[PDB]
Amino acid sequence: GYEVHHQKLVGSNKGAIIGLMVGGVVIA
Amino acid sequence: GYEVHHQKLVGSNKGAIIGLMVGGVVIA
Amino acid sequence: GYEVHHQKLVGSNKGAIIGLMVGGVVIA
Amino acid sequence: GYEVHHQKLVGSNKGAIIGLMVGGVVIA
Amino acid sequence: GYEVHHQKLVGSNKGAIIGLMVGGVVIA
Amino acid sequence: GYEVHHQKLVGSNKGAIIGLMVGGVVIA
Amino acid sequence: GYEVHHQKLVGSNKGAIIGLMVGGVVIA
Amino acid sequence: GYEVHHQKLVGSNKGAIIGLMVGGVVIA
Amino acid sequence: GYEVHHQKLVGSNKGAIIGLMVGGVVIA
Amino acid sequence: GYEVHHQKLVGSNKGAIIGLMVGGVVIA
């Protein structure tokens, strides 16, 4: 399937992340 | 399938990320 | 299939990213 | 700006919604 | 700015919703 | 600007929705 | 600008939707 | 500008939709 | 299939990216 | 098939990118 020997990963949020939005308002 | 020996990954958000939007408003 | 020896990856958002939009408004 | 008199809104998820993904795996 | 007189809103999840994912696995 | 008298809206996910992806794998 | 008297809207996903992709793999 | 009396809209995805792609692979 | 020895990848958004849009409005 | 020894890739958005559009409006 999926195989990796050696790795380094980074994820970062500094803003807005939304899954499901109804009717709202998002700024920046 | 999918194979890798050595890697480095970065992901970053500094703005707005939305999955599913109904009727709302997004600024920047 | 898919094979790599050595790599570096970057992904960045500084604006608006939307999956599915109904009826709404996006500015920048 | 933005103006509405009368409305009805629905949003629904039955699958996978992701904002920011690094290195992972998504099935269906 | 933003104005509405009369409204009805619904949001529902029956699956997977994630903000920020590093290295994990999501099924359905 | 933006103006509406009367409306009905629906948004639905039954699959995969991703904002920002680095290096990962998506099936269906 | 933008004006509507009466309307009905539907949006649906049954597959894969991606905003920004780096290096990854999408099947269906 | 943009004006409508009466309308019905549908949008549907059954496959792969990508915004911005770097280096990756898409099947179907 | 797909094979690479050595590589560097960058992806960046500074504007609007949308997957599926119904009826909405996008500015910049 | 597809083979590379050494490479550098960049992708950038500074405007509007849309996958599938029904009935909406895009400015810039």
Author numbering:
A (entry chain I), B (entry chain G), C (entry chain E), D (entry chain H), E (entry chain J), F (entry chain F), ...: 1 to 28
Copied sentences from the primary study:
The Uppsala APP mutation (Δ690–695 in APP, Δ19–24 in Aβ) is the first known multi-codon deletion causing autosomal dominant AD. Discovered in three individuals from a family in Sweden, this mutation gives rise to a dominantly inherited form of early onset fAD. To summarize, we solved the fibril structures underlying the tau and Aβ pathologies in a transgenic mouse model and a patient carrying the Uppsala APP mutation, the first known multi-codon deletion mutation in the APP gene leading to AD.
In addition, we investigated the structure of AβUpp(1–42)Δ19–24 fibrils formed at pH 2 from synthetic AβUpp(1–42)Δ19–24 monomers by cryo-EM. Subsequent cryo-EM analyses revealed the presence of four abundant polymorphs accounting for 43.5% (PM1), 16.9% (PM2), 14.4% (PM3), and 8.4% (PM4) of all fibrils in the dataset. Residues G9-K28 form the L-shaped domain, preceding the C-terminal U-shaped domain (K28-A42). The N-terminal domain is fixed in its position by a hydrogen bond between Y10 and G37. However, they all share the same C-terminal U-shape formed by residues K28-A42, which folds around a hydrophobic cluster of residues A30, I32, M35, V40, and A42.
